[PDB]
Amino acid sequence: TVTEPVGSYARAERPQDFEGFVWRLDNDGKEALPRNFRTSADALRAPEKKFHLDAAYVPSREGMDALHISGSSAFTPAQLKNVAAKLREKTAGPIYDVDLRQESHGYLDGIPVSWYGERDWANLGKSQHEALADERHRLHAALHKTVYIAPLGKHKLPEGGEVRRVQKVQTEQEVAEAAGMRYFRIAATDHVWPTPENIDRFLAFYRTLPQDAWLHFHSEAGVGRTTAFMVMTDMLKNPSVSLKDILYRQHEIGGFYYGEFPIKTKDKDSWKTKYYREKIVMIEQFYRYVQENRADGYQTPWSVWLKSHPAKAL
Numbered sequence: 001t002v003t004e005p006v007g008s009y010a011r012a013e014r015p016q017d018f019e020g021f022v023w024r025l026d027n028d029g030k031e032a033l034p035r036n037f038r039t040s041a042d043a044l045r046a047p048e049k050k051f052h053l054d055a056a057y058v059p060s061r062e063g064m065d066a067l068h069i070s071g072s073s074a075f076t077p078a079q080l081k082n083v084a085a086k087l088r089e090k091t092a093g094p095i096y097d098v099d100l101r102q103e104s105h106g107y108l109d110g111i112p113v114s115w116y117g118e119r120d121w122a123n124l125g126k127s128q129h130e131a132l133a134d135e136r137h138r139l140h141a142a143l144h145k146t147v148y149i150a151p152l153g154k155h156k157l158p159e160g161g162e163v164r165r166v167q168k169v170q171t172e173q174e175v176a177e178a179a180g181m182r183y184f185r186i187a188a189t190d191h192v193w194p195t196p197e198n199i200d201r202f203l204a205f206y207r208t209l210p211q212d213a214w215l216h217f218h219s220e221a222g223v224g225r226t227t228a229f230m231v232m233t234d235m236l237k238n239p240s241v242s243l244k245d246i247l248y249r250q251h252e253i254g255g256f257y258y259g260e261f262p263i264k265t266k267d268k269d270s271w272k273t274k275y276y277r278e279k280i281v282m283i284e285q286f287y288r289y290v291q292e293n294r295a296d297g298y299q300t301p302w303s304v305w306l307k308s309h310p311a312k313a314l
């Protein structure tokens with residue numbers, strides 16, 4: 001009897017130990033665009049040394065022109081508008097803001113903030129219903145109230161920032177719509193592989209999208225969670241493309257590399273190590289799901305299939 005199967009390790013952590021304690025500044029708004037902005041129309045560039053990949057390797061671009069996806073970090077409303085404008089030049093289809101953040105976040109006086117708990121796990125273990133409920137309550141509770149908004153220091157603790165009496169509160173959905181983008185939330189926990197719940201939701205959503213739909217994925221940094229879903233979308237829309245080509249091309253356009261590599265972390269970040277290994281295994285497990293379920297149109301949901309074909313630990 002296994003308590004937590006591969007892909008659900010995070011379920012063993014205690015939520016009560018990472019509760020939110022401060023409104024974190026998600027972006028200073030000094031740049032015109034969010035950080036790590038990238039699209040599937042972008043040219044591939046040299047891989048990052050840390051991933052020890054083959055720089056001479058030329059990944060196939062098959063299906064990238066019609067992939068129509070992009071990724072980025074969190075953003076201010078103005079930055080989102082700039083993103084929408086840039087994407088509108090590439091498509092005449094609906095542009096979706098796919099919010100992959102489980103952590104409660106929103107905008108106070110137009111400032112992008114999030115209720116930060118240690119490890120960014122303020123909503124760990126909560127269902128999407130509970131997470132959004134927490135988010136809605138906190139945002140509203142901030143109106144006409146004094147709050148402290150601050151960026152984090154090297155040890156993930158408040159550093160400087162500012163104090164203000166909020167006069168306007170907005171959800172990301174509001175910001176997205178005001179930017180001319182449709183909105184879709186997937187409460188994925190930061191630093192770990194998306195839950196079976198997260199993926200089932202995405203998969204159902206993905207199946208009903210128009211042919212010309214453009215997906216702009218984003219999380220906090222625009223790296224871990226953002227790349228995982230960009231990778232999954234790439235595999236789903238281009239099942240004939242090898243796992244290697246998918247992983248390489250998603251990384252070389254500016255994303256994270258989800259294949260094996262010499263994982264290295266500072267002592268204070270040693271806790272992230274097993275979660276990185278788990279994601280590597282689950283990336284391969286999803287690829288297997290796509291290859292073995294595409295033929296019948298994915299009649300079997302990911303969560304169901306996963307239980308029938310559990311991934312092997314690392």
Ligand SMILES: [Cl-]
Pocket residue numbers: 126127128129197
């Ligand atoms: Cl849920």
